[PDB]
């Protein structure tokens, strides 16, 4: 029997998750329900038409007053803001993909379990006693008896992979980081109220600085990096695809070329499929739909004074993350005891 | 400087309104209250820094604990979602500029009167039987009796002025209209749930067609055009300033240079300070902060088959419309029995 | 089997080669590219496209004077002068002239005046010059024509359904405005330009720009001379445009009648050319469409029984390029 | 006195320079000639209308078919792409503002001298060993017998001022830098021909990596920094205003607060008018028209491990740089032997 999956929050990560899964090969999962404040009208139209991804090459037509049909498969489209009131027990849901961005805390994520679901995966950094995992970095450490887990944030998944390599092979004493990130739906379209007075500013018109937890989050999946990193973010006028700029003071003297090699190795061995060295003089858009969590721009790699390293890595924050979420969902399935 | 004003909803229109007023000489109005759910802190910032208007050149310091000082003017910042509860009777408020876009009908805007306010000017099309005006067109018909009134939409403020001219000097049989408009708060930064599947699409990435009653609305301020006009709107990737494309069939044969000559007459006469004719080959950004609700782009004026006329008009949907809310508010102020 | 040479490896040039590469069995064999920017920049720019996406194939350079696209090998020359182009030495029949410069006989000629026996200007042509819009009057093409124009992306969207309208309601007169994505002609930031409007920052403004498009329709549909006209409105999108046609017909009519008319033609004389969309979509949705003109059904309006307003979507780069790869097919076919 | 000035390359810097100068009071300069490839047509129109600066608050209009008048002051408008053929000897041109970005070496700039002008100020880095200066950092070292000088790049002018403070106050051992920069006229609107395959990609749709010689140009005006810094650039979809993300390893151990304090200190003394510290949460737009070459974003300053400092400074590449160009021209005109 295949694991039954419910998607809470059919937004950007929610919809990228389905389209990722769809393109999967022998998914140990079966998306059978969606939930979101909108009904079939939105859930359907928005899954078929995407300004970022494009039109979904699949049949996406409503399927009755409460469901959509994707290539013959029917998916229940429920619509209740209160997770405690979802047909999870009634639909026999195994894994819930929490993509609302408003149930990332344990008491909130647990509501899904109270409602029937046996497990919940927060598509964002979690709050509370929530184990955090990053595929290719430490998801191997997951345990079947853990009901609620976090897949972290899109920046930690780009950072973690190559921080692992850098630390292991050179020993990261300390470092700082900056992610020039594509704007998200959290910022405003035009100057408007927001708890953060910077995110309140017209998103597509500005370079908007904002904090990030990635630098400190890395320490959750890479214990050794605890207290060593630190960083910020610069939201820029692009709809998707971002880049993280890391500078670390390594313990072992090295050079740009030696560093890029280390990555290419990793790309072939342990981080096979998660990391990827690019040697082409490309640009942001060239990475739309990149299945890699982190792609080093090898030619940008710098080494100042023998031990100060600069590394720029690309990532598609919507797609790349979503794929990762799927990989973690598959991991949670394969450990299903 | 005489009548006490309170601004409900300190969004784009509200703040534009405040700056417009702040710039008038010898004013009937005195702004003493801003209701904003975001608090003094947020109001002070978004008023001072504007991604569209630039830094407001005035000393904007907070005043006391619940007010702000604009060039020495103390303005109270209250904060309640329910208009019925605002300290209007307490502050002595005469006119309320409804700028939330969620209290457009009588019961809605009516709450301000319950609250102690004497009159309400809805900065948007009203719902049901609500007096509607357009300065330069029918604002003189305002009766000091009417407690709640409408200043129509920004597009309706661009048409009426020159449709008044076309229908008068050429008789309008019928026409159609398409307004290439800048995006606005009602659109989504990225594809996301919205009642209008067109508006749910990433604003700064597409050309979004959307309906608009502006066409029909002209029939309220210019009775003669009832049922004669109709149109749509195409939202485009610009933060501010819009253009109206009008095509009317007149009854009196004519040519381009005459139509334009006509518009220039209204400019120096019955439509001074409202209608304007531009002869230089400009672009949208050149019309930022234009005090004219409508500016004809003469070199674009075309006449096909002696009586099918096309007129292209420019307008700052934010600024210009606000200059009009102030004008209507001034009319209300100088007709206070 | 009919040696083709792409002159000007720009948006169209490169969009052209990709559309063609996609054709299941073309009578066209592209043997040479000629741009003012070396082979490397040629292979690279072809492989990665901000608007099209990564070109799914194998675009690796084959030597310092040619590239190997998905097996085949295309020579890549580089000369600012057509006269100096190795057309005879390569045996070119038709040179797709997509540089934007040589758009008249004296200019486009140098190509034929150096080898090629036929040129297809990917834009309007100066004065007396054979113009063709596939699906409207491409049949009138006689092999006698040494040079021909495939019109502009807008005329190819306007001509199709403007025909359907006249043939079914008869256009008395008409006006037209095109909300168009900016293009290479425009400056990135305010900088000198012949056209004071095209000098303004493309991505920051709604830029009014004049166009032939409307009058052009007259050329492909003689029955419209002296009736249509209109301006263009450049907007902050890098691709896809929309034409807003307003015509006064003689035959009293209404919205759904007009649409019904479009839907028929859609699956008859205009299948693959015109299409009717009944979905509340947006510009980006129409990226890579193969129809010169896609009517946005729900936007069709009719005032006073005989004033019709129709909105049609078209990918100004791909859609147009597809027709160029067709007006080439037309040519190849009627080869005497 | 009052040296006669000529502007070569009426581009962004050329036009911003004129407006910067125009706004000065008591200027030792008098701009009396403009050379570009457009003539009075473009010249008048583009000086008046600016999608970035807005409408120039001056009476701009052509004077004859070979000059223009700005507030009555008439300025010649020549048009020859070959400096050698410029009317410098007859116009009595003293100093030339070279902003074509194509005559940036001695053989190039020299052509202006060969044509009559006494001095040349390259509004960009010079090729070879042209005397480079950065106002506030070393422009005082300028010598009257140096015919051709360079005002360095815009990034260098931003970075130089606060690098001067950091090294002076904490001692810079080594550092790396990343400038998220607005796109300029050197990038292409849509994917087109360019020697650089990154800058070839549509500018307003990507984050574009691109080299920068700023990091090492700093060593030119602050010798102690030679060999110690490297860096990269990332062009983003904004029309104007940039930010440099600087990370350095210092000798003296410090903390975020100590660093900012030093900037404010310098800000009020040695770098007065050149450096500023911003304490409010602003975005890129809020910095348009800043006369400072470098404005620190105090709240972003971080220190990791006692001595790895990360500083962020904003700057209007166009307007800011131009203000410094006027300053360098003043400096040149005040040591006129
Ligand atoms: N876009 C990215 O780059 C990205 C990447 C990684 C992780 N994330 C994380 O994913 C989460 C969602 O991000 P997003 O970009 O998709 O945002 P989004 O706005 O597109 O999606 C949120 C969705 O949840 C729905 N929703 C809100 N409250 C709800 C409720 N009570 N019940 C049901 N549905 C509700 C909304 O209608 C919407 O469809 C956040 O935690 C975010 O931090 C985002
Ligand atoms: N943007 C334009 O060009 C424009 C032009 C003319 C008319 N209008 C109309 O003006 C209105 C506002 O438009 P806007 O663009 O300024 O939008 P906006 O989103 O910037 O402003 C709406 C404001 O009202 C506040 N608000 C919402 N509910 C409230 C409540 N119950 N109590 C108090 N404040 C509340 C919001 O938080 C916000 O500050 C709409 O009716 C709109 O149609 C807009
Ligand atoms: N982009 C569109 O949507 C579009 C649509 C339809 C028709 N067109 C027409 O196509 C033409 C080109 O448009 P584009 O968008 O591809 O522009 P573009 O600037 O990208 O392409 C022009 C190309 O020609 C090259 N070129 C210029 N002069 C040359 C010379 N002397 N020799 C060789 N190569 C030379 C350039 O380096 C470039 O590769 C124009 O005539 C335009 O009207 C464009
Ligand atoms: N915009 C910035 O951020 C910036 C900042 C600092 C320094 N700079 C430097 O300033 C220079 C100009 O940059 P810009 O952005 O103002 O460029 P730009 O494209 O806006 O202007 C360059 C101008 O020079 C003219 N020109 C080119 N060749 C010419 C010739 N032979 N004769 C006469 N005029 C000629 C062009 O027509 C144009 O008006 C470049 O060297 C650039 O590196 C630019």
Per the annotation, the verdict on B154 as an active-site residue is: yes
**In the structure encoding, which two tokens stand for residue D140, read together?**
């005082």
Residues B285, D51: C-beta atoms closer than 8 Å:
yes
CB of C319 within 8 A of CB of C156? yes
Closest atom of ligand 1 relative to the A102 alpha carbon: 28
- Burial group, residue A11, by CB count within 10 angstroms (0-12, 13-18, 19+): buried
Q: In Å, how far are A41, A143, B88, D294 from A66, measured between CA atoms?
A: 10, 35, 46, 57
Is C212 annotated among the ligand-binding residues? yes
Bridge partners (DSSP) of residue A68 are A62, A75
Which of helix, strand or coil describes residue B167? helix
Instruction: Write the Ramachandran bin of D72: left for phi over 0, alpha for psi from -120 to 50, otherwise beta.
Output: left
CB of D78 within 8 A of CB of D6? no
How many angstroms separate the first and last alpha carbons of chain D? Answer: 12
Q: What is the CATH number of the domain that holds B186?
A: 3.30.360.10
> Do B18 and B65 belong to one domain?
yes
Residue with tokens 């981080």: A271
Identify which of B301, B180, B321 has the alpha carbon closest to the alpha carbon of residue C206: B180
Q: Is the dihedral of CA D291, D292, D293, D299 positive or negative?
A: negative
Which of helix, strand or coil describes residue D80? coil
Is D155 annotated among the ligand-binding residues? yes
Domain count, chain B: 2
In angstroms, how far is CA A62 from the centroid of its own chain? 28
Contact of A283 with chain C, judged by CB distance below 8 Å, is answered with yes
CB of A6 within 8 A of CB of A96? yes
Cα–Cα distance, A279 to A296 (Å, whole number) = 8
Q: Which chains touch B (3 or more CB pairs under 8 A)?
A: A, C, D
Beta-carbon contacts of residue C153 (< 8 Å; ≥ 6 apart): C241, C314, C316, C317, C319, C320
> Do D291 and D306 belong to one domain?
yes
Cα–Cα distance, C237 to B205 (Å, whole number) = 7
Which of helix, strand or coil describes residue C152? coil
> Do A243 and A111 belong to one domain?
no
Bridge partners (DSSP) of residue D122 are D98, D150
Cα–Cα distance, D335 to D337 (Å, whole number) = 6
Task: State if residue C321 touches ligand 3 by the CB under 6 angstroms criterion.
Answer: no
Cα–Cα distance, A128 to A84 (Å, whole number) = 18
Contact of D286 with chain B, judged by CB distance below 8 Å, is answered with yes
Residues C307, B198: C-beta atoms closer than 8 Å:
no
Contact of B282 with chain D, judged by CB distance below 8 Å, is answered with yes
Report resolution in angstroms.
2.6
Q: What is the secondary structure of C162-179 as a DSSP string?
A: HHHHHHHH-EEEEEEEEE
Cα–Cα distance, B84 to B77 (Å, whole number) = 16
> Do D146 and D161 belong to one domain?
no
CB pairs under 8 A between A and B: 99
In angstroms, how far is CA D254 from the centroid of its own chain? 31
> Do C225 and C192 belong to one domain?
yes
Q: In Å, how far are A218, A259, A303, A313, C239 from A265, measured between CA atoms?
A: 21, 10, 19, 16, 40
Q: What is the secondary structure of C65-128 as a DSSP string?
A: TEEEETTS-EEEE--S-GGGS-STTTT-SEEEE-SSS--SHHHHHHHHTTT-SEEEESS---SS
- Burial group, residue C58, by CB count within 10 angstroms (0-12, 13-18, 19+): exposed
CB of A5 within 8 A of CB of A30? yes
> Do B174 and B72 belong to one domain?
no
- A225 phi/psi in degrees, rounded to 5: -80, 5
Identify which of C107, C142, C139 has the alpha carbon closest to the alpha carbon of residue C123: C107
> Do D145 and D164 belong to one domain?
no
> Do C144 and C252 belong to one domain?
no
**In the structure encoding, which two tokens stand for residue D202, read together?**
């549509």
How far is A242 from chain D, CA to nearest CA, in Å?
A: 8
Cα–Cα distance, D53 to D30 (Å, whole number) = 22
Q: In Å, how far are A153, A214, A221, D14 from A224, measured between CA atoms?
A: 19, 15, 9, 53
Residue with tokens 């830094």: B55
Provide the 10 A C-beta neighbour count for residue D330: 18
Q: In Å, how far are A257, A336, C50 from D234, measured between CA atoms?
A: 21, 45, 16
CB of D225 within 8 A of CB of D219? yes
Kindly list the protein residues whose Cβ atom lies closer than 6 A to any atom of ligand 4.
C 191-192; D 8-14, 35-37, 81, 99-102, 123-124, 153-154, 184-185, 317-318, 321
Cα–Cα distance, D221 to D158 (Å, whole number) = 13
How far is D175 from chain A, CA to nearest CA, in Å?
A: 7
Q: What is the CATH number of the domain that holds D58?
A: 3.40.50.720
> Do B311 and B325 belong to one domain?
no
Q: In Å, how far are A256, A258, A295 from A301, measured between CA atoms?
A: 6, 10, 12
Which chain D residues contact residue C192 at CB under 8 A?
10-11, 36-38, 42, 46
Residues A234, D180: C-beta atoms closer than 8 Å:
yes
Query: What was the experiment behind these coordinates?
Result: X-ray
Which chain D residues contact residue A178 at CB under 8 A?
178, 245
SS (H, E, C) chain A: CCEEEEEECCCHHHHHHHHHHHCCCCCCEEEEEEECCCHHHHHHHHHHCCCCCCCCCCCEEECCCCEEEECCEEEEEECCCCHHHCCCCCCCCCEEEECCCCCCEHHHHHHHHHCCCCEEEECCCCECCCCECCCCCCHHHCCCCCCEEECCCHHHHHHHHHHHHHHHHHCEEEEEEEEEEECCCCCCCCCCCCCCCCCCCCCCCCCEEEECCHHHHHHHHCHHHCCCCCEEEEEECCCCCEEEEEEEEECCCCCHHHHHHHHHHHHHCCCECCECCCCCCCCHHHHCCCCCCEEECHHHCEEECCCEEEEEEEECCCHHHHHHHHHHHHHHHHCCC
In angstroms, how far is CA C121 from the centroid of its own chain? 10
CB of A87 within 8 A of CB of A33? yes
Is D13 annotated among the ligand-binding residues? yes
Residue with tokens 């900056």: A178
> Do A174 and A121 belong to one domain?
no
- A277 phi/psi in degrees, rounded to 5: -80, 125
Cα–Cα distance, D305 to D296 (Å, whole number) = 21
Cα–Cα distance, C183 to C202 (Å, whole number) = 8
Q: What is the secondary structure of D124-176 as a DSSP string?
A: SPPSSS--B--TTTTGGG--TT-SEEE---HHHHHHHHHHHHHHHHH-EEEEE
> Do C157 and C143 belong to one domain?
no
Residue with tokens 């694991």: A3
Instruction: Write the Ramachandran bin of D13: left for phi over 0, alpha for psi from -120 to 50, otherwise beta.
Output: alpha
Its domain, for residue D35, covers: 3-152+318-337
Determine how β-strand B308-315 pairs with β-strand B302-304: antiparallel
**Side-chain-facing half-sphere of D147: CA atoms under 13 Å:** 13
CA max distance for chain C: 65
**In the structure encoding, which two tokens stand for residue A216, read together?**
């400190």
Q: In Å, how far are A2, A123, A327, A333 from A28, measured between CA atoms?
A: 6, 19, 10, 7
Contact of B49 with chain A, judged by CB distance below 8 Å, is answered with yes
Q: In Å, how far are A159, A212, B103, B145, D258 from B93, measured between CA atoms?
A: 55, 44, 18, 17, 49
For C113-261, strand residue ranges (E) read: 118-121, 147-149, 171-181, 207-210, 231-235, 241-249
Cα–Cα distance, B162 to B265 (Å, whole number) = 11
> Measured at the alpha carbon of residue B167, what is the angle toward residues B165 and B170, in degrees to the nearest 5?
95
Bridge partners (DSSP) of residue C118 are C94
> Do D223 and D180 belong to one domain?
yes
DSSP B4: E
Q: In Å, how far are A156, A271, B216, C170, C215 from C302, measured between CA atoms?
A: 55, 61, 14, 15, 23
Cα–Cα distance, C240 to D226 (Å, whole number) = 49
SS (H, E, C) D46-77: HHHCCCCCCCCCCCEEEECCCEEEECCEEEEE
Contact of C179 with chain B, judged by CB distance below 8 Å, is answered with yes
Q: In Å, how far are B134, B188, B227 from A187, measured between CA atoms?
A: 34, 10, 41
Closest chain D residue to the Cα of A306, Cα to Cα? D174
């Amino acid at each position: 029997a295949k694991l039954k999956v419910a998607i809470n929050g059919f937004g950007r990560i929610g919809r990228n998750f389905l389209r990722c899964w769809h393109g999967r090969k022998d998914s140990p999962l079966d998306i059978i329900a969606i939930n979101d404040t909108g009904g079939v009208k939105q859930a359907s139209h928005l899954l078929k038409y995407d300004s970022t991804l494009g039109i979904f090459d699949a049949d996406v037509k409503p399927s009755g007053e409460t469901a959509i049909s994707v290539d013959g498969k029917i998916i229940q489209v429920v619509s209740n803001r209160n997770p405690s009131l979802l047909p999870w027990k009634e639909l026999g849901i195994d894994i819930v993909i929490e993509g609302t961005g408003v149930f990332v805390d344990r008491e909130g994520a647990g509501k899904h379990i109270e409602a029937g679901a046996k497990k919940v995966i927060i598509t964002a950094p979690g709050k509370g006693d929530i184990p955090t995992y990053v595929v290719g970095v430490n998801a191997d450490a997951y345990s079947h008896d853990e009901p609620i887990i976090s897949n972290a944030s899109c920046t930690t998944n780009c950072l973690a992979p190559f921080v692992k390599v850098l630390d292991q092979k050179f020993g990261i004493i300390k470092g700082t980081m900056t992610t020039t990130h594509s704007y998200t739906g959290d910022q405003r379209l035009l100057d408007a109220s927001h708890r953060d007075l910077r995110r309140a500013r017209a998103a597509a018109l500005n370079i908007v600085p904002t904090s990030t937890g990635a630098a400190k989050a890395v320490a959750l999946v890479l214990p050794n990096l605890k207290g060593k990193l630190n960083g910020i973010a610069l939201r820029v006028p692009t709809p998707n695809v971002s880049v993280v700029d890391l500078v670390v003071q390594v313990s072992k003297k090295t050079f740009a070329e030696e560093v890029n090699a280390a990555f290419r190795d990793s790309a072939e061995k342990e981080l096979k499929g998660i990391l990827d060295v690019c040697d082409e003089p490309l640009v942001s858009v060239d990475f739309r739909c990149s299945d890699f969590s982190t792609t080093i721009d090898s030619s940008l790699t710098m080494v100042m004074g023998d031990d100060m390293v600069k590394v720029i890595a690309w990532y598609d924050n919507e797609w790349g993350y979503s794929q990762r979420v799927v990989d973690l969902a598959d991991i949670v399935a394969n450990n299903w005891k």
